[PDB]
Design a binder for this molecule. Structure first.
Ligand code: SAM
Length: 322
């Protein structure tokens, strides 16, 4: 039937949209996704922005003719750019990581295409570890900015939901591998589509990401004990996990390497920890804990906390006993 098509700037399969264009939520639709996609491509390729600068128009997101018209202007401009690249003009640099602004758009696009019924993520057992909530792009970006990962680092989102934390980190850092592990059926199911849509859109934009895997599973399992021990950066949105789950996580953290880091929405050790002869076995003895600077109280997880595995604290206490 009626179709809208956007050509890829790097010659991947065109993106196809049905008419009428679908709505995602109260503030997101396919019409606007299309217009923003064109805008971001224009950001990627200055030549394209030029052509699009030359013969802007009153887009009626209501009108098919109008939307087909705008898509045509973009597709024609993409054709001419590809011809330009056949001449002397340098083509778009391949396999670079997306800009922060492009990444935000890509992840929203992937989410809207994969999470078909968002309401279904609220079907959890309340007052349980299953409680769903998403860390915002802005907080994830802060975590990336401040905890600096290198190609030596291994990153894991414990309880990864639909996987959008892991995708953002895979696109912004050069870790060897990123993992997400999610237990609940509904988000784990959506994460499978998120995985596919992300790999497809990233290829469409011609942008690179690191290796990652989104898995279904229980991060408290026997298998996961050793995986946690060998992870250098743990992200865990544990605000609603409870004391029992946190206690079990502490036990698994106590096997992590020196300099390992844990980012969480509820501290695993009090910020003002001081070693004495009664707390000698508390996880607080082997880590520093700092509250990440707030981004400029509600009831929902807002603040996040960085834990760094530092055994010199325990060592020091013993040297002082001598
Ligand atoms: C608040 S959500 C966090 C989603 C995502 N990591 C984020 O921050 O945007 C917490 C997730 O942890 C999951 N979870 C709880 N216990 C788990 C377990 N034992 N193993 C794997 N996932 C678990 C829940 O199913 C839930 O989807």
């Amino acid at each position: 039937k009626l179709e809208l098509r956007l050509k890829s700037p790097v010659g991947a399969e065109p993106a196809v949209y049905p008419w009428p264009l679908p709505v995602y939520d109260k503030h997101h639709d396919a019409a606007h996704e299309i217009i923003e996609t064109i805008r971001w491509v224009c950001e990627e390729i200055p030549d394209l922005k030029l052509a699009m600068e030359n013969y802007l128009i009153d887009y009626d997101t209501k009108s098919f003719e109008s939307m087909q018209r705008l898509c045509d202007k973009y597709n024609r401009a993409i054709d001419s750019i590809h011809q330009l690249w056949k001449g002397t003009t340098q083509p778009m640099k391949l396999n670079t990581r997306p800009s922060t602004g492009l990444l935000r758009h890509i992840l929203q696009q992937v989410y809207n295409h994969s999470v078909t019924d968002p309401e279904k993520l609220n079907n959890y057992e309340p007052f349980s570890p299953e409680v769903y909530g998403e860390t915002s792009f802005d907080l994830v970006a802060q975590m990336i900015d401040e905890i600096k990962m290198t190609d030596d680092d291994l990153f894991v989102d414990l309880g990864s939901g639909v996987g959008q934390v892991v995708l953002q980190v895979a696109a912004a850092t050069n870790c060897k591998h990123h993992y997400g592990v999610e237990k609940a059926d509904i988000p784990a199911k959506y994460a499978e589509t998120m995985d596919r849509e992300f790999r497809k859109w990233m290829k469409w934009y011609g942008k690179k990401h690191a290796e990652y895997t989104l898995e279904r599973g229980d991060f408290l399992s026997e298998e996961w004990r050793e995986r946690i021990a060998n992870t250098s950066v743990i992200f865990v949105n544990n605000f609603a996990f409870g004391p029992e789950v946190d206690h079990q996580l502490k036990e698994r953290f106590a096997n992590m390497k020196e300099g390992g880091r844990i980012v969480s929405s509820k501290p695993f050790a009090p910020l003002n920890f001081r070693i004495n002869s009664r707390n000698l076995s508390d996880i607080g003895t082997i880590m520093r804990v700092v509250e990440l600077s707030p981004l400029k109280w509600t009831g929902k997880p807002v603040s996040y906390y960085l834990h760094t595995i530092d055994r010199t604290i325990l060592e020091n206490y013993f040297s002082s006993l001598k």
